[PDB]
Amino acid sequence: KDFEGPLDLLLHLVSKYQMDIYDVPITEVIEQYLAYVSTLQAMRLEVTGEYMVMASQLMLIKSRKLLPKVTDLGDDLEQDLLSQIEEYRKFKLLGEHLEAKHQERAQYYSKAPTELIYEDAELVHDKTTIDLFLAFSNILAKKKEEF
Amino acid sequence: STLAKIEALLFVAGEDGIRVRQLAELLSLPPTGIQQSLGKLAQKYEKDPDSSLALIETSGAYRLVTKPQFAEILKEYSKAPINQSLSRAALETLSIIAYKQPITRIEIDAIRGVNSSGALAKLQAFDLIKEDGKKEVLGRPNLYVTTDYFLDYMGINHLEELPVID
């Protein structure tokens, strides 16, 4: 139950069908989603949060797809859910290629810049109360946002 | 030596590194000549089996670092922010900014599917991304980009050097 959002879950389901990107396996996939939405919420309905708002977008799709051919919305409100999952994959992947390119960089270590001190050197008042603020604030963030 | 002068400075700067340009305005040599010494240097280190250093060029600056092997050792001792990996969320959120740059918080959330508020902060706390432009909407949105540190963190000199969607 630890997936990075709804779009992330779709990429898992949409995955299964291998083949190309979509290829009309929608009507099917949609069901699978609600499945985990209702069955898993039968007992533990605590981390729904955002996913919920997604359940909604699907409802309309399943529904509005029933009605016959009256710029069709029964469709656009489908092809768009596809584009969303695709573009998400693209970044879910580009994401990995960064955590990989980073690793190489992380193999190298260096030293904190030696704080030189010279007599003649005079102070430049280019810093202000705002600076000193974000400064201490940051250090607070960095570490605190971690365990 | 000129090799000795370069190392000396490059050492003092450490993690901050120095730019070829700025190295000339200090040694008094042509920017093209530093390039040459800098290569002889990184090579002097390469050969020396008793040397742990290595020259590296990220974000258009040359930085004095440790040869990749000693990472196993140092990993215990250092753990400086640049060697720490990132959470999948920040990693992915970062990717989106990295490319769709300049971008907005909502746009990211949209693309990413969930709320990015948490990542934007963490990433910004690490000086990886910074807010530059502004947005003309019925909300005065803010635009997010990448800092020079982002190049360094990625070990590249120019943004274009990022992998490509193939």
Add this chain to the structure above:
Amino acid sequence: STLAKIEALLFVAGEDGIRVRQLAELLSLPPTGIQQSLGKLAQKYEKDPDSSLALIETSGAYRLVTKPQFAEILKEYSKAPINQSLSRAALETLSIIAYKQPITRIEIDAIRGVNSSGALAKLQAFDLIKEDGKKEVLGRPNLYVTTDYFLDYMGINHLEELPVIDE
């Protein structure tokens, strides 16, 4: 190469330095050898005119430094416009004092995580901070505080004008 291994450590330790008994521990070697190893490692830099660094010992702490024959070239670097202003670390340090003073070196280090005696060094040169007693603990470490000039420099007239902060 053990000399390489020691150098990497000595290198990343930065300014505060590293302990023989500690090097031994990390590298799994009797302090006896680490000792002789540092002896040779120090002469290697000495022998080579192309290396800009010589190794030194400060109260049991081994740390790297540049050979004095470069003092001039460095002094110039420290005059370039950039360095004429507080570093990313000197500012980080300066702020921590401003808000948590009185505070000790060890305590300031524990917040930035990294050693920072060298930053504290510059802030005292610019009369931004000063020593004001010694914490009443074992070792009686020095207590650091911002100064009168700090206020001026910051364009303020009392530590109470600093932006509040509560997490």
